[PDB]
Structure formats: structure tokens, C-alpha cells
Amino acid sequence: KRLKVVAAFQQSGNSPMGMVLDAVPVIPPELRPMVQLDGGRFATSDLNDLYRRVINRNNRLKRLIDLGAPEIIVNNEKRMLQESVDALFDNGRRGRPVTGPGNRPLKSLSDLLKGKQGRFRQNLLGKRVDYSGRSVIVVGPQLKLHQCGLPKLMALELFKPFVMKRLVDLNHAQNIKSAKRMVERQRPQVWDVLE
Amino acid sequence: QAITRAMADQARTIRIPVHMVEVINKLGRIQRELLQDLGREPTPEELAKEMDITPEKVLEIQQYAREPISLDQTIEGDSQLGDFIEDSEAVVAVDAVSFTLLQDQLQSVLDTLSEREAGVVRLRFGLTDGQPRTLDEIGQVYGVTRERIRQIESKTMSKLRHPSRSQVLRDYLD
Amino acid sequence: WLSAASFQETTRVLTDAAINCRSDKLNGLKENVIIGKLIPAGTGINRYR
Amino acid sequence: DVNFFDELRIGLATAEDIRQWSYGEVKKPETINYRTLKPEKDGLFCEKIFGPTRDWECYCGKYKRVRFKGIICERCGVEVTRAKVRRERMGHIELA
Amino acid sequence: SNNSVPGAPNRVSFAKLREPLEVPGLLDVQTDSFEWLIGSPRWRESAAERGDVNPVGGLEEVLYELSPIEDFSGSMSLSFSDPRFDDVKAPVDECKDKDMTYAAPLFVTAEFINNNTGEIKSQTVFMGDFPMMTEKGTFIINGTERVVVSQLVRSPGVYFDETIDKSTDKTLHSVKVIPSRGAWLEFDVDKRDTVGVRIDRKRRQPVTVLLKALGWTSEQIVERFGFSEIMRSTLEKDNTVGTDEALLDIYRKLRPGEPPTKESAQTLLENLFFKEKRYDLARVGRYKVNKKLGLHVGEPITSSTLTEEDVVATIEYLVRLHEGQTTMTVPGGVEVPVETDDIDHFGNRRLRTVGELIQNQIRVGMSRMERVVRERMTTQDVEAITPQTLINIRPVVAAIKEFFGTSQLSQFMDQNNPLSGLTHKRRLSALGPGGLSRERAGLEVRDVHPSHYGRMCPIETPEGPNIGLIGSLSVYARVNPFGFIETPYRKVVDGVVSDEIVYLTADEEDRHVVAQANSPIDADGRFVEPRVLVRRKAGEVEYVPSSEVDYMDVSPRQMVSVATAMIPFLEHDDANRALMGANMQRQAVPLVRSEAPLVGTGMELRAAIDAGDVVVAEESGVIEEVSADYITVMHDNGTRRTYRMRKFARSNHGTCANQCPIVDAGDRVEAGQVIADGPCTDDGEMALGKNLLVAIMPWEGHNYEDAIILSNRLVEEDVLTSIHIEEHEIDARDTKLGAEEITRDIPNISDEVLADLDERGIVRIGAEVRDGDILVGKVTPKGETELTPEERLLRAIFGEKAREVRDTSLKVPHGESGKVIGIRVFSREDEDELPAGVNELVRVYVAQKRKISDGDKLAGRHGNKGVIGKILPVEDMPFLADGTPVDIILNTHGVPRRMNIGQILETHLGWCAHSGWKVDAAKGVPDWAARLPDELLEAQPNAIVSTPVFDGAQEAELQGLLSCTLPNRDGDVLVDADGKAMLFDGRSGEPFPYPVTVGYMYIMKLHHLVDDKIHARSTGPYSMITQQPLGGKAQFGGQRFGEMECWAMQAYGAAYTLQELLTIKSDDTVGRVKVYEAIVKGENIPEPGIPESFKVLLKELQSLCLNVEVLSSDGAAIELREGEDE
DNA sequence: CATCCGTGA
DNA sequence: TATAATGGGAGCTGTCACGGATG
Ligand SMILES: CO[C@H]1CCO[C@@]2(C)Oc3c(C)c(O)c4c(O)c(c5c(c4c3C2=O)NC2(CCN(CC(C)C)CC2)N5)NC(=O)[C@H](C)CCC[C@H](C)[C@H](O)[C@@H](C)[C@@H](O)[C@@H](C)[C@H](OC(=O)c2ccccc2)[C@@H]1C
Ligand SMILES: [Zn+2]
């Protein structure tokens, strides 16, 4: 089992020095966004409180190193720095997780990928789609096996840019902007066009 | 001293300066003082007069103290607040498409207009440029001087009335 | 490793794959769906495509 | 931006590979300002590092037009391309 | 009659005479609880009537635990006493209107005692504004009606468990001591016959190590536990001996990393288990340990802490139960039954009500300010200390405010129907803080326990993943002062039933023997047969002689809940559908006007009254004046009380709470009588639906697979029509570019669109609104960014200068429409107090008059659900001989499968009730109608009757009554003795070949309407990060094509369909725009690009120090619309 | 072949 | 920012079935 580890670092020139970091990368801001709600309060991502945790402690080390602090104090800071970078990379992995307000575990980097909610099973293997809708179903003994009753309301929003196309074709609207207005106001013309 | 200082300095996810923190803690102090005096939580007007005598800032202070919440926090299989936040940045499909069709209408204007006429149009408005150059430079950077380029401007403003009388530009303003 | 990580034990899959320097030839169903390529089956194969 | 690329490789990232990615080092815990609501400098949202908040809008306001493309403002060091870069540009922290 | 108490309509009942007791106040679970919290007069009287010695309120208790607050010196002492309230700061209706919390301010009397100066400064301190509970048993937090649900937690105490070993196959016994709050302590027995103890989940050590640590000699160990060979084997295998060596040993294994003093190991063994600070069994925690051990059983509850006596007497309980002993007497204690305890038994399962839930949160807050008190004492000087300077109530007001809007104990007030509230006001949830999680709950917690009888319903529980973890309280049950569930039983002296009633707890009943309610009783009180049906401990049942009968049930319907007892012929429907029959009643919708069911159960009255959504007369008198607005009542003493009618109000769930006066002007009305009912109520009775003329048959397939066919009569006469109100909101804030202003002037809008507004920009009341129309015109100053050079050019031609104000109007959401029925405007100008930044806030209320249509979910009380497949014209409907068309056509196929043939019996009795009947009295009273009470031997057309659960009609009487059916106006009977009748197909005219079962059924309108359910989207909003579509009808989002659906595509081999869905239909930034253009221009769909989500992943990986590079066929790393630069 | 931690359902 | 002051404090409770490292 040990060889399976050591043999993988020998083959590719892939240095094992990587398992110790001197500089940690910071994920782009729009992937850890900070947004103002309509209530005036702000809503931020959890990575911003963990990045903030690391930087705050890392800088404090710089101060304590410079001031020639005793090892007892310096080492403590070092240790917290380890638990900080760890808590960011994988929270809860070693010890108790970092709790935000209300004893809630913060979402770590690795948490963005894990399980059902993880980026994988929830954003790649199955996404959400445009040009789609949903409603209750009802029996229709009148329809043939290749047919289905689609509500006049559902279809108009489903084929919305296909209807806007033919509205300006047959000059009911003068452009694409006004043809949009026709469909939204639900002018009596569009029920013939959509058919 | 160092604890209180560092605390007010680091605890806020959005940093507020030292004096600002001092204000809020004085506002929480006078509030608790007026809290046992009036048997009720004091009105904004009441609190203001006592400490800073300004009602408008107290409302503002009480928003600064409001601590932010987490996007990743949830309500439900999976709540996740961030799954409701609409991306106000992304481009509307129809609105981007209609702008492009407005470019097909200004291409049918560079034509009816002369080459001198469709010249100043793209000069001071900056279509291909992206910048609106000063007119006393435009007339001098164009091979034709005596600011003839402002003379050709009026030779176009009414030439634009015809595609405005065709109303094909009248529809895109409403 | 794309197919593996998108199945189970995502933290374990990546740890091993990043060490072994495993390169992924994006030639499979789960593989292609993720990157948005046409799936290598049915009407997606070059024979019919 | 062709879709057909043959392989996808994953490996262990060097400490130097982290530096080759980042457009700068974050040296402040701060996110934004409390009055201006603007991304503070050398912070976690610093526009010098990750990019402009608005399209072709430099931070200190010296440049606000699309005419400047790729210009690095001297007063604050912000490139002028879309906020579409704040989804692709990396940062890094230098641990002591 | 059934309930001849208030002044109600006469609902005649098939019944054995029920005179044990009236249904106790349903809302009492919330009321009595909160009254204990504040220590109200009605409670101290209720404490007196119950014979409770020295009653202590919920607030009174918290103060006495806390008091007195001294520092380490003992110099300073702070104590509290005498809590008192002022009047509520604002009436209920104003709180709902001005979105503030219904609360009355709380005061206490605090005094600062100083032992050095000997002086005392005593004054009154303000404690904050305290949320008060209404009469309908709810709270009002920030303008919304909320409800605190009761939680089912594990009761503190000592519990014994018998686990069977896998290898040795011997019986091993395990004990576990649970504090209300503190460290853990559990004694278990090995297969090695050696006793071990785990403290706070630390490793196992011999039990003698603990005794030698206590100070018990090595000889006393041989004495007390010498009667067993397993304890002699433990003291022998004991590693070390010595009082010092034991404490050190325990210390070493408890807290490694700390220097072991003989004075530090002695200390923490005292604090972790024998101090009020670190350890605490509640009043229930102490009481439960005592009952199980039987010591100090008579002595009042003064100890809140564990003792050495309890530790030893617990170890003694373990060893005896291990070697087969059945009973034991603790030295100094009464004899106690020795056995393994079941965790789910309602004597060990605890019900913490509203009061304690608030109390616990209050205790949390008082502990927080105590910490500040002990910090403000050491800071300030002794001479200038007042309680006003020590006390900071800020953590207290926060703790209570957090709970009512930060915890899961404040469930939203389901506003579906007068029953929706009722059901929701009394719920037994095992979820929530202190309780269990959904994933932690196994299969034992969820299923029906024997002790649930008469306490918690076995039927009412959700269908979903929450099943068994949520239930309703049984009708006749109540909560005892210790948080357990009591239930009423009739007391039998010696074979003779006595009207004397005593409430029993779960474990207390197990010690006794109970007879079934329906057992035949002499007119005096004696039993008929020597051997009767008998309920016994552990859910076992046997025949037992009449000499051994202790108690008997109050009612046949004792075990059920409120909504459950409203299901006629319950004992004819299987628990599966009967479950849904109870759950669905909750989702009924209030119709335009409501009819009482032809078939009742009697419960429909008391449910309506105790709902609080009807108007009950307080004091007797005569109606002095009545209007659609209010009712005035002239009492007997002279005083006048006026009852205002809730008219057309929007509930929590957009249903129509509308009240109407029952009484006319001048009617004599007594106290407790319903003078005006609300939605879903007809003459003070729960009217959850309509009485429909049903037909049990397949009909041209339109009712295939549980679908439903309706008569258009229900559309032309609004029989199943409802009103639905929506609240639309929008505000104007202060921005950086100016301020949002609400105006009638919106950029580039005709006067045809603005036509329905007033001068301010608000829609006018009574106006009609469709989707897309404007309700509140608001414009905001848009950022001064360089306008398009192509739009600059377009503004020079037509010479129209651009405005700097963008349209930010409140338009009507897709699907919504109706009549504007009111405006609420709040202006910062008109001194209306607004949040920081807001100027004008507008509320427009729009109601809809939704008639019933296709896809609307209907249901009966028997779990018979389904949606409306088709509504035929009135003539197409299968009709009887006299021409009357049926209303509803249910399919025959979906009846015997569901075992819910109570819907069949309802149809039979339902027809007899519509036609009327008359038993043949000539040649005497028939033998079948011999048990039928006199009042039902003759019935009028459209009569109302009661079929109480586990009583009421039996199949023999029903069959006979079908023969009694009175003829119509034409003098002809329409149905036979079978209950069937002959129909004519309204389409072909010809008579149906066979007799069809016809009658009347009660059908409810459920809150699953297509007008809400339907939704679609071409393009719309998109995710801020993943750049995918948003989700939900509220955000106008598209459907989710999940992992399961991508397999179906893959299986088919539809690569291009699958690709499109995940590319140009999803998060391809440049693709979806160029697809919209290709469509509107009529060209071909372009080729998809790269999913922006995949770009996100490759950047998220990079942030994790994972060098991820994309390679082309050559092997070079290609860019992804970006570049790398140092 | 049977326990302890971590990871899913 | 000069009286003296010197080692924390909440735990969290009712899973389940399995593989892999250790016994
Ligand atoms: C804060 O309260 C919320 C919980 C918190 O979280 C958990 C972890 O704790 C819970 C606790 C302690 C409970 O007892 C629960 C409970 O008793 C439920 C449901 C859950 C929970 C539940 C949780 O999930 N959860 C789902 C919800 C939906 N997901 C369903 C998905 C498939 C669509 C499945 C399970 N059902 N009901 C039933 O079983 C019976 C059969 C009938 C329902 C009665 C009635 C419909 C209901 O009383 C509402 C009027 C209202 O009270 C609800 C809506 C509350 O929402 C606001 O009140 C509310 C107020 C303001 C804004 C928003 C919401 C929820 C409850
Ligand atoms: Zn600049």
C-alpha cells in the first residue's frame, strides 16, 4: 500500500513537495459573491469568512514573528493558521467544524463538490433548462396516442420567440420589441398565430 | 486595549472604522439606559436627541450595525438562499437581440446618406471608434477642413427625417 | 476521474487522481455530458453524425 | 473557443503554480467599504486584482469609457475589460 | 341529539348514550400552557382546583433558580421577585395591520443586597416587551399569525436496556443516565461478568473504581453488592486500590493533558455530577429517577441534582436485573418493579408545551445577562451599584425575539380552513432543537406505540419523509404539570360504572386494567357478561372476569384526533386511505358560501367553535343591532358588547376569511352561542365541502385512474367556487443616484396603460388587473453611464432627450388576475414609521373569483382524492328518472382496492338523508331498527344526522333505511333497497343496462389548483454563479432536467437533444442568446459552445491547488476565453 | 473473520 | 495605558450498512 503512494510520485516528475503549501490560491469573487438584498441587508458566501479567517491569522503571524515573540505564542499562531487553512479546504474534517451565526457549519471549498448538493451531482449531471414548464395532468380519451393537450397559456410562453417571429412576419407588429409586447398583453391575434 | 481594538477591527465582515464602532456601542448603551426608564423600546427620535441630537444618522447607524447573513445558509431537501438570488448582471436574450436589429437599421442609414454625410455621423457619435471626438478635432482630422464637417451635419439631420418618416426608427423608441 | 468523482466519495477520488497525474480522455457518457460534448452513443457517434 | 479538445489532465499544484495563476496577493481581510460600498484595495474584492466592477470602468474613475481597452490606469492599476473577468481571475495569499 | 349544549342545529345521532364528559377545550393545549408561563389568575385557580400544593409560575420559577446572584466574595447579592405585566401596547388587529408584535411589557422587582455595607437598594426594572398569546391560541410576530408547536422529547431520567450479545448469546444489561443538561453517565454489563462505566463517552473502566473514588470502603463494596458473583468478580479484577489511586485513575482517563492534583481530581468529580452549575436533572429529571428507584418518593421536589445515593441505588438496580431478579427495595425506599425500560413509552417520552419552550429560551437569556451582571459587579464601586447599572436586558429581549423568528418552534399559522388552524395549533413533533433530526430517526420512533391510545392519534401523520415524527393530540387528552400526557377513564368500583373520572398517565395505566368503551352496561352501572374485553400493559389483550375490572374507556372515539373523528364510518376504511382522509381535510378551501354535510359525526360543531374563526357570544342577551359590518349585543345587566365582522380578509395562505352574521336583529341569544360564523362554517359547524349527488360508475373513460367528472351545475351555481386574495408589495428606497419615487409618469408608456391609475401612480380600487399590467408606478434614477452611440444617434434623429429614470414599476405577476379590492400606503412623510431607507411603501390587494375547472384537486373524507378530468354540460350528465342530473361521477374501479368503502356507506346514508325516511311501525317496531333510537324512526327531506366513529350506523340499519326512502314530489321512489337506481345516458338517451349506485357524498375543494400549479418559461432570469436558469414559479424559472432524466435521454440515444438541454438551453452564456436570434430570424440553430458551469468547476479546482489543464490533440494547454498572467 | 472512523442513503 | 488582577466551557444525545485499517 505504501508503494502505491511512493510509486506515483516517482513516475511523472510530480513533486511530493506540493502536499505542503507556501501560498494558497483564492477563488474568483463572483464565485464567492457578495450581494445586497432588497431588505438592505447583505448576503455573502461562506468562503469570504474563511478566507478572512486565514488572512487575519496569517498577518498576525507576521506581526508576532517580527516582534520577536516567544515560541509559545508564535507556535500557537502557527497552529491556528493550520486549522484555518484546513477549515477552508475541508471544514469538519479534523475536529469540530467552524460555526457561523446560529451554530451552523460553514460551507468549505470541498463542500461545494460533495454528494448530492455538490457541484457534480447537482449542477453537471442534471441542470435546469429554459423553454420548459409544468402543470397538472388530466385524462383525455379523445386524443390519439401521438397527441397531448397543451394549455393555450403554457404554449404561448413556450413558443414565445417563435410567435414573436411570425408576428413581425405578418406585420401585426412592426418589430421584435413590439411583438414582445403583443404576446405579454395577450392580444387576440396571437391565438391564431400560435396555432 | 489591544483586544477591544482588534475586536472592533476584525469582527466586522465589512470593516467599519474605530470611531464608528464607538458610536454603535454608545447607541446600545443609551438605549439600554432609556430602556429601563420608559418601560418600552425608545423611538428613533428619542434616542437621537439624547446623544447626537440628529435623528437621520441614528437610522443610518442602526443599519451599519446590521450583521450580514450567509448565502450558503438554508431554510426542505436543500434550501440554499443563493439559489434564489437573481443574477442582475447576465444579459437579457430579447433585449440583446433587439439592439442588434437596431444595428441593421443604422446600416440602412449609412447608405442613403452620402460618404461625407455618413462620415461625421460615425465621427462625433463614435460607432466604430467608441469615443466621441471634439468637433474642432474632427473637422481637422478629416481631410476636409473649414469645419465643413459641421456643415455636412445639417446636410444629414433632415436626410435622417426620411427614415424617420418611414417610421422604421419610430418603432424602436416606444 | 471525472466519471468517478461525479459518482461517490468525491474527496477521495480527487486526492488520488491529483497525485497519480491521471489524464482523462473525455470519451464516455458521464464524461461527455459534463463538458457539454455530444454523448458517444446513438446519434452522437461520427458514423451517424 | 472550439469545443473539441482531446484530454483533461489533473495534477498536484506546485506552490509556484499558484503564483503563476494569481494576478496579485490579497493582503487585507476587508471585503468592501462601509460607506462607498466599493471593493476596497488589496482586499478580497480588490479591483486591481480581480477586475472592474462595471464594464470598462476603472476604480478611481479616471477611465470610464469603452474606448480604453487593455489600458492599465496609473492611479490604481485596474485593467479595463468587462466584469466578466471576476469569474476567471485568481488570487493568492502568501503564508509566512 | 348529540351536543345539546350551546344552542346548535339538531343533529340526530345513531348512538349508545354518551354521558361521560363533553369534549374538553380543544385549544387548551396552548392556552393552559401559556397561562402557566405568566402565572395568570385562571391558572392559580386551576392549580387550586387540581389541588396543586404551592404553585410556581413559569416566570416565577426562572427567577428562583437564578436568585440570588452573588460573586465569589459573597459581598454583593442580586435577586429578583414579583413579575408583573402592563396592558398590551396595541390591540391584535392593529398589530396585524402595522406589522408589529402583539406584546405586553414585563416588569420585575430587583434588589441589590450587600453583606458588607448591610444596605439594600430595591427598585423596579423594565425587562422588555413580552409576546402575548391571543384567545385563538396563537402569537403575532411582525404582523403574521404564528403558532408554537409542542415538542416530543426524551424525558430525563435513568433508563435500562437489555441488549443481546452476538457472540456469547447471553443477555447483557445496559443503563444510561440522562440529565436535563450536563455530562453523561452510563453503566453497562460485559459478557465477561464485569461491570463498567462510561463517563461522557470515555473508555470503559471497572465500576469499583468509581465506588472507591466516592469514598466507599473496599469492605462496604463486599457488603452491598455481595449477593452477586458478578460484582465479586469485578472488585477482584479491580486493578488498583485506594481512595487517592481511584480519583487519580478516573482523572487520568477523563482529562489527559492536565496535572493531576489530589485536590483537582476530587474537585471535578463533585462538579460534573453533584453541582447545580454543571449538572442538572429537571423537576421531571429528579421525579423520573425517583420513581424508577423509589427513594424519597413522598418527599416534595426540592433536589435538582444527582446524589451518591442515586449512583449506588442505580448500580444495585443493574446487577439484580442482570441475574434475573424481578423486584427490589432500595434501603430507605419503597419497593419498585425491576425491568428494562422502553424509550418510546409515553411515561418515558415527554411532551414539552409552549410554556416550557418559551421558558427554556428565557432561561437561556437570563444566563447571558447573569454573566454580564457578574462582570458589572467587579468593575463598578460598591457604593454606586444599583440594579439599573447591573442589569442589561439586551440579551433577554434578543433571546425571546430570536426564538419566535429564529427557531423552528414557531410554525407558521396554516390558514387553510377553520380546521387547518385547529389541527395546526396542536401538533406533536419530535423534530426541533433538543429533539431528533430526520436522518437520526429509525423505524421504531415512527410507528404506532400501545401507549398512544387516547393520548396521541395513530392515524393522523404526514405521508412524506416526516411520517411518524409528526402527529396530532387525541381529543380527550390533556397535559399534566410534568409534561406527560394524561387521558380520561371512567372509574369502576366493583363491576359498577361510576361517573367519577380520573386522568391517568401512560405508565400508571399499565399497572391497572381497562375495559373497552362499548362494553354493555346495566342501566344502574353494572356489566352484562362476567368476562369482558380488557386492555393490558404492553398492548396485550385478554378476557377478564368482571371482579377484576378497574377502569373503562370514556368514549369509543377516545383514541382518535380531532380531524380523525370527523371521518364518518372510519372503521370501514383502511388506515392507509383513512390517513390521507385526515390529512386532506386540512387542505380544504373556503368556498363562496358553505353548506354543512348531510352526513356528520357530531365533531363538526365543537371543532367550529373551538377554532376561534367563528363569532361566539360572550354574555347572554338580545341582538340590539345587526349589519354586514358588525353585531351589537344588549346584555342583561345593561352593558353592550359589539362584535366586528372580519370581512374579505386575506389569510396566511391567500384563502378568503369572510364572516357573516347568523342571527337576525332581535333574536334572544344565550352565552356560548355562535352568532356569526366564518369561512367553511354553516350554522356553527365545520363546513369543509358540499353535498354532491354522486354516481358510482365508469363513464366514457373520463374518470379513468382516479380522475373526476363534474356537472356544469357546479360552475353555473358556484357550488365549488372560491375566492383567493393576494398581497402585492413594493417600496421606494434611497439610492446613490437619488431616490426612488412613486409617480404616474413612467418612461415610454401610453396613457392607455396608465388609464387605471390615480394621480399618485397607484391603481384605483375596484379596477381590473391582468398579468403584465401596472399596479404601482415607480421609477428610479439609472446610473449616468454612456448611452449607446447607436442609441445616441437614434435620439438625435427624433430629437427626444433621454430621461435618467428607469422603469421599476410593480407589474402583475404571470398568471395572477382579478379585481383590486384595497390599497394600503405607508409614507415616511405621513410619519408612518418605516425601515431605514424607505420612503413610500404600497400594498395593493387583489382577489380572484376562481370557479372550479379542469385539474383542480377534489376529495372526500375517506382518502378518495383525484383531479377534475372533465366538466360536461348539465345535459350530458347521467340522470335519474325524474330528470335530475347527478353532480359528480366517480369511477367504480378505484374503490375496493383502497378498502375505503366508507365512502360507499356515506353514499347510502347520504341518500336516505336527502329523501327522508320512515320506519314501519305497524305490526310493531321492526327487529333491525330495534337498536335505533326513537328520534330517527322518522326523518324529513334534507335531514342532518351523526355517525360517531366506532358508533353510529351499522350495516343492518343502513340496508333497512334504504327501503324506507321517501318518494319524490311525483310520488315515486328513486332508489331501491340495494341503494342503486336506474340512470339514463344523457348522450345517447338510452337507459344504462344495469342499476347504478346513486346517493349524496360530501366533497371538499382542496388547495391544489391548476391556476397556481401551471407554469412555463421560454427565457428568463439566470443563476448568478452557475449561469444556469433560476428555479421556481415565483422566480419564473425553468424545470430541472436531473441526473435521472439524463439517463433516459442517454438510453434513447438522443445526443443532440441531451446536448442542447445542457448547453444552449442552459448555461451557455453566448449560446442561448444566439439561439433566441436564430429562432426569431427563422434560421437554423447554431452549434453549442462550452457550458459556463464547466468553466466554474475548472476554476474551483484551481482554487484548491489542483493544476487542471485542457489539452488539444497535440498536447498543448489551450485557453478558455481567458489567459494566465503572473 | 470481527471493531472504529468517515461517507454516503 | 501604573491599586491588583494570572489554566475554558459547552457538551448532545433515537441510525444504518459497508469497506479498510487493526485485532
Ligand atoms: C419554520 O417551519 C418550517 C419547518 C422547518 O424545518 C424542518 C426541518 O423542521 C420541521 C418541523 C419542526 C415540523 O414540525 C415540520 C412539519 O410539521 C411539516 C413539514 C416540515 C417540517 C419541518 C422541517 O422541514 N417540512 C415539510 C415542509 C416542505 N418540505 C416539502 C417539499 C417536498 C415541498 C417537506 C416537509 N413539511 N408538515 C407535516 O408533516 C404535516 C403533515 C402537515 C403540514 C402542516 C402545515 C402545512 C404547516 O404547519 C405550515 C402551515 C407551516 O408551519 C410550515 C410550512 C413551516 O413553514 C413556515 O411556517 C414558513 C413560514 C414563513 C415562510 C416560509 C415557511 C415549516 C414547517
Ligand atoms: Zn484609475
mmCIF file of C-alpha atoms in Angstrom, chain A residues 30 33-35 37 39-49 52 56 60 101 104 107 112 116-117 122 164 174-177 180-181, chain B residues 10-14 63 66-74 77-78 80-81 83 85 87 89 94-95 97-98 101 166-167 171-172 174:
data_model
loop_
_atom_site.group_PDB
_atom_site.id
_atom_site.type_symbol
_atom_site.label_atom_id
_atom_site.label_comp_id
_atom_site.label_asym_id
_atom_site.label_seq_id
_atom_site.Cartn_x
_atom_site.Cartn_y
_atom_site.Cartn_z
ATOM 1 C CA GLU A 30 -18.026 36.217 -8.445
ATOM 2 C CA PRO A 33 -20.244 36.633 -4.316
ATOM 3 C CA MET A 34 -21.458 39.389 -2.010
ATOM 4 C CA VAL A 35 -24.957 40.687 -2.740
ATOM 5 C CA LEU A 37 -30.830 42.194 -0.860
ATOM 6 C CA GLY A 39 -34.139 44.476 2.531
ATOM 7 C CA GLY A 40 -30.894 46.431 2.560
ATOM 8 C CA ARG A 41 -29.046 43.661 4.364
ATOM 9 C CA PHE A 42 -26.140 41.969 2.604
ATOM 10 C CA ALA A 43 -25.840 38.270 1.783
ATOM 11 C CA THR A 44 -22.330 36.860 1.386
ATOM 12 C CA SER A 45 -20.729 33.473 0.692
ATOM 13 C CA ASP A 46 -19.080 31.370 3.395
ATOM 14 C CA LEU A 47 -15.687 31.265 1.675
ATOM 15 C CA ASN A 48 -15.330 35.001 2.386
ATOM 16 C CA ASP A 49 -15.421 34.400 6.137
ATOM 17 C CA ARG A 52 -10.872 36.326 6.017
ATOM 18 C CA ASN A 56 -6.327 37.639 9.618
ATOM 19 C CA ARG A 60 -0.925 38.270 12.861
ATOM 20 C CA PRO A 101 -24.000 32.510 13.461
ATOM 21 C CA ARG A 104 -24.283 26.438 11.566
ATOM 22 C CA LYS A 107 -19.516 25.584 3.655
ATOM 23 C CA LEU A 112 -19.052 22.633 -2.965
ATOM 24 C CA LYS A 116 -25.991 15.457 -3.911
ATOM 25 C CA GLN A 117 -25.582 19.146 -3.325
ATOM 26 C CA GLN A 122 -26.411 18.798 -8.676
ATOM 27 C CA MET A 164 -42.747 36.893 -31.967
ATOM 28 C CA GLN A 174 -43.600 46.450 -36.613
ATOM 29 C CA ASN A 175 -40.543 44.973 -34.889
ATOM 30 C CA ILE A 176 -39.289 42.452 -32.322
ATOM 31 C CA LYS A 177 -39.729 44.813 -29.373
ATOM 32 C CA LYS A 180 -42.946 41.022 -27.451
ATOM 33 C CA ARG A 181 -45.498 43.468 -26.062
ATOM 34 C CA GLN B 10 -11.594 42.314 12.690
ATOM 35 C CA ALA B 11 -15.028 41.097 13.851
ATOM 36 C CA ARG B 12 -16.951 43.002 11.189
ATOM 37 C CA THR B 13 -17.196 41.153 7.870
ATOM 38 C CA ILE B 14 -17.475 44.628 6.377
ATOM 39 C CA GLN B 63 -28.030 49.794 9.535
ATOM 40 C CA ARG B 66 -26.762 45.073 10.995
ATOM 41 C CA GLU B 67 -24.612 41.958 10.645
ATOM 42 C CA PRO B 68 -24.723 40.155 7.269
ATOM 43 C CA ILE B 69 -26.135 36.675 6.694
ATOM 44 C CA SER B 70 -24.721 33.745 4.740
ATOM 45 C CA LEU B 71 -25.682 32.821 1.187
ATOM 46 C CA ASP B 72 -24.931 29.158 1.916
ATOM 47 C CA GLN B 73 -27.373 29.124 4.842
ATOM 48 C CA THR B 74 -30.505 27.087 4.180
ATOM 49 C CA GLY B 77 -34.430 18.968 0.870
ATOM 50 C CA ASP B 78 -31.979 21.759 0.138
ATOM 51 C CA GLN B 80 -29.838 27.453 -0.029
ATOM 52 C CA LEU B 81 -30.611 31.206 -0.174
ATOM 53 C CA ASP B 83 -30.395 29.549 -5.224
ATOM 54 C CA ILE B 85 -30.562 35.348 -5.863
ATOM 55 C CA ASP B 87 -28.086 37.381 -11.464
ATOM 56 C CA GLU B 89 -25.623 41.024 -14.413
ATOM 57 C CA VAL B 94 -34.569 39.580 -26.267
ATOM 58 C CA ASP B 95 -33.062 42.938 -25.209
ATOM 59 C CA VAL B 97 -31.314 40.759 -29.865
ATOM 60 C CA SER B 98 -33.374 43.924 -30.336
ATOM 61 C CA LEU B 101 -31.721 44.736 -35.092
ATOM 62 C CA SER B 166 -40.647 55.791 -42.912
ATOM 63 C CA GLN B 167 -41.196 55.349 -39.159
ATOM 64 C CA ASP B 171 -40.994 51.979 -33.533
ATOM 65 C CA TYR B 172 -37.751 51.420 -31.615
ATOM 66 C CA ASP B 174 -41.593 53.315 -27.986
#
